[PDB]
Write a protein that holds these residues in place. Structure first.
Motif, short mmCIF file in Angstrom:
data_model
loop_
_atom_site.label_atom_id
_atom_site.label_comp_id
_atom_site.label_asym_id
_atom_site.label_seq_id
_atom_site.Cartn_x
_atom_site.Cartn_y
_atom_site.Cartn_z
N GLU B 88 76.58 41.70 55.28
CA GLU B 88 75.49 42.10 56.15
C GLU B 88 74.83 43.37 55.62
O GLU B 88 75.51 44.35 55.32
N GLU B 89 73.50 43.33 55.52
CA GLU B 89 72.71 44.49 55.12
C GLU B 89 71.74 44.82 56.24
O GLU B 89 71.02 43.94 56.72
N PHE B 90 71.74 46.08 56.66
CA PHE B 90 70.83 46.56 57.69
C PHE B 90 70.25 47.90 57.26
O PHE B 90 70.85 48.64 56.48
N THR B 91 69.06 48.20 57.77
CA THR B 91 68.36 49.43 57.48
C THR B 91 68.20 50.24 58.76
O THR B 91 68.07 49.69 59.85
N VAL B 92 68.20 51.57 58.61
CA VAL B 92 68.03 52.44 59.76
C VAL B 92 66.68 52.17 60.41
O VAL B 92 65.66 52.03 59.73
N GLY B 93 66.68 52.08 61.74
CA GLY B 93 65.49 51.77 62.49
C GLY B 93 65.24 50.30 62.73
O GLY B 93 64.30 49.96 63.46
N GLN B 94 66.04 49.42 62.13
CA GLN B 94 65.88 47.99 62.36
C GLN B 94 66.20 47.63 63.80
O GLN B 94 67.11 48.20 64.41
N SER B 95 65.45 46.68 64.34
CA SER B 95 65.66 46.19 65.70
C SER B 95 66.32 44.82 65.63
O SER B 95 65.82 43.92 64.94
N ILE B 96 67.43 44.66 66.33
CA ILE B 96 68.18 43.41 66.38
C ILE B 96 68.03 42.84 67.78
O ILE B 96 68.39 43.49 68.77
N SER B 97 67.51 41.62 67.87
CA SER B 97 67.24 40.97 69.14
C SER B 97 68.34 39.96 69.47
O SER B 97 69.23 39.68 68.66
N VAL B 98 68.25 39.40 70.67
CA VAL B 98 69.23 38.42 71.13
C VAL B 98 69.16 37.12 70.33
O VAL B 98 70.06 36.28 70.46
#
Lengths: 56, 209, 142
Positions: B88-98
């Motif tokens: 899993e790769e994520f960036t700061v400020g990313q929004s994760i929805s349902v």
RNA sequence: GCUGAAAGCAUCUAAGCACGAAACUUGCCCCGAGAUGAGUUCUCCCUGACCCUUUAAGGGUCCUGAAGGAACGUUGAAGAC
RNA sequence: GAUGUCGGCUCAUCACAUCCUGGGGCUGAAGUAGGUCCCAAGGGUAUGGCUGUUCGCCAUUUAAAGUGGUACGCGAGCUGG
RNA sequence: GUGAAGAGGGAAACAACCCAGACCGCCAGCUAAGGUCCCAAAGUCAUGGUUAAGUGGGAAACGAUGUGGGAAGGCCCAGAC
RNA sequence: CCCGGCGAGGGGAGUGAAAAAGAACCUGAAACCGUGUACGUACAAGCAGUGGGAGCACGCUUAGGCGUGUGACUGCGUACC
């Protein structure tokens, strides 16, 4: 039910280490009357937040 | 994979066309904003810290505001961390929805159970009640014996006694995902979940599988 | 006159680094305990920690004779009724190798507040690298 | 069980290698850095002037009082306190 | 110059010489189902009739209704047949 | 014989066992039983062997090509096992 | 004379050789309970001492390394009748 040995004066003081009372940190001052009072409580003269609540 | 943070709206039922009533717990999962990304080089492990909801700007402390400001996201009601499963790769400020739960079909729900306060052994440990009559003297719900004689002249650690019950972290595993409503930010899971209405919930895909 | 007594505020402590690869566990531990207590110093005082700081490298490669590698058992009780837990020498080496040397040395050190302080001067590392270069440890062929 | 000598053979074993259970170590759930071995990461706050002396992790005065905390109040599906 | 007892109730905890479940060798082991021995203590391990009874007999269940230690565990926890 | 009426050292702890009989003082020396890798005072002492079982550091009838030493015996380059 | 409820109980003043001889009154011990000061004490296990012993404080007195208080750490040590 009862002790087998007499607890010491040291043990008695240790238990009482949490018995000390705490003084009020500070007393509020009425803006108009100017007298000290407990915060959120009316003054001895019947004032509260400078409104002169019933004093009869 | 990673999970999401939501709020327990309450419980209701879903009527299927085949005549089956499914008890569902409604979970409000607003967008989860990534406030920090932790990696092996700096933190020694891979995880993402996320926030959700909104908090009064007047009640956000300066140390907290700086943390949110660095990520460039609005402050939420709290912070939660999810470990990353090496892919899993994520960036700061990313929004994760349902929508992340679209094809999960089974989730693990964690929350703080309702607080029962100081509970007796009967309620806390399902201890058997003694006789209500037949001579019983002031010992109707008392624990009874709590050990053996001189040989173990002590009560063993872990003895089941009265004490605080509930108000603790609890996880319920393998709950079917009845519905995922992205438009309304709702997640319906069959069955009950820990905690009272309005409490925070952590939803993750089922680990047992 | 009165016999000399070491003062903890003026006692000189040196830093040493020891490679534990291939060393017998017990025979290495005795020397570590001896040096940690300060028995090798003429200024040795039973109630004062006159020992030296010792760094142990490659703790996972310590050697044991006989079948002790699979037969030596480390017991400990957690305090609960079941409590009793055991681990073999191989399991300890695989899980936390540093504890093997630490446990061996701790038993050989005196018991009490002073002995606990002496144990604090031992730095055991599983790998061949340590981050104490600032202390300029001296190689000790023990 | 495999391969295999001591013991020309045989041999699961001595060197070496492969299987093998609700037990063991993990995997699942909870607690957990008073883990005094007291850990890590992110963010926030404080950038005065003098005096004394047995002159140092020293004491005292004036100015300063931040981040934050506590207290008080309204309270809670939190709670004996 | 006091260490209160049988049984019941409540609450247990350990041992393994294992009752069930798990893994095996042998069998006068065709299969099903058994006998015997070895390994295994993770969890589990009846309700009733009679009797103060433990026990026992009986009725009907259960995968099984294990054997022992714990002041024949447990009356500053209850009961008192 | 010791304890009883006897301290001291040793046997982990241990009146009766081993060493040994405390008039007082010493921050002097030599020894007994017992000991000399660390806890813990003194040999990681020297030489030649044994053990592989942590035997040492709990035990019998009995069982076994474990291994060391010793004195014989049967068959063997007319070819042994 | 003053605080206090025209209290209780105190602080002055005055008497007296003495009021810490004030009627709860000569002398005023111990248990027991406090205030102040020095030192120790929040990773350490047990008849609370004893032998060793740092540090701190204080007193020295013709630096004199001494006395007094405290007692980190450490060997030994299970009250009396």
């Amino acid at each position: 039910a009862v002790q087998q040995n007499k607890p010491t004066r040291s043990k008695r003081g240790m238990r009482r280490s949490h018995d000390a009372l705490t003084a009020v940190t500070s007393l509020s001052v009425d803006k108009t009357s100017g007298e000290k009072h407990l915060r959120h409580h009316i003054t001895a003269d019947g004032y509260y937040r400078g409104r002169k609540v019933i004093a009869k | 994979m990673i999970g999401l943070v939501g709020k327990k709206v309450g419980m209701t039922r879903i009527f299927t066309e085949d005549g089956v009533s499914i008890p569902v717990t409604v979970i409000e999962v607003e967008a989860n904003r990534v406030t920090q990304v932790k990696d092996l080089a700096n933190d020694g492990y891979r995880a993402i810290q996320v926030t959700t909801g909104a908090k009064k700007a007047n009640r956000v402390t300066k140390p907290e505001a700086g943390h949110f400001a660095k990520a460039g996201v609005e402050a939420g009601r709290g912070l939660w961390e999810f470990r990353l499963a090496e892919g899993e790769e994520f960036t700061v400020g990313q929004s994760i929805s349902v929508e992340l739960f679209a094809d999960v079909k089974k989730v693990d729900v964690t929350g703080t159970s309702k607080g029962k306060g100081f509970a007796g052994t009967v309620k806390r440990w399902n201890f058997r009640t003694q006789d209500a009559t037949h001579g019983n003297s002031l010992s109707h719900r008392v624990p009874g014996s709590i050990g053996q004689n001189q040989t173990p002249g002590k009560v063993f650690k872990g003895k089941k006694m009265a004490g605080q019950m509930g108000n603790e972290r609890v996880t319920v595993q393998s709950l079917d995902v009845v519905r995922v409503d992205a438009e309304r930010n709702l997640l319906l899971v069959k069955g009950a979940v820990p905690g009272a209405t309005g409490s925070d919930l952590i939803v993750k895909p089922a680990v047992k599988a | 006159m009165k016999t000399f007594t070491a003062k903890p505020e003026t006692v000189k402590r040196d830093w040493y680094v020891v490679d534990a690869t291939g060393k017998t566990l017990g025979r290495l531990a005795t020397e570590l305990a001896r040096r940690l207590r300060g028995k090798h110093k003429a200024e040795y005082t039973p109630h004062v920690d006159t020992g030296d700081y010792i760094i142990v490298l490659n703790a996972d490669k310590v050697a044991v004779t006989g079948n002790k590698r699979t037969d030596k058992v480390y017991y400990h009780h957690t305090g609960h009724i079941g409590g009793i837990k055991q681990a073999t020498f191989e399991e300890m080496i695989a899980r936390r190798p540093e504890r093997v040397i630490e446990i061996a040395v701790k038993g050989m050190l005196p018991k009490g507040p002073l002995g606990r302080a002496m144990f604090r001067k031992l730095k055991v590392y599983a790998g061949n690298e340590h981050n104490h270069a600032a202390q300029q440890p001296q190689v000790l062929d023990i």
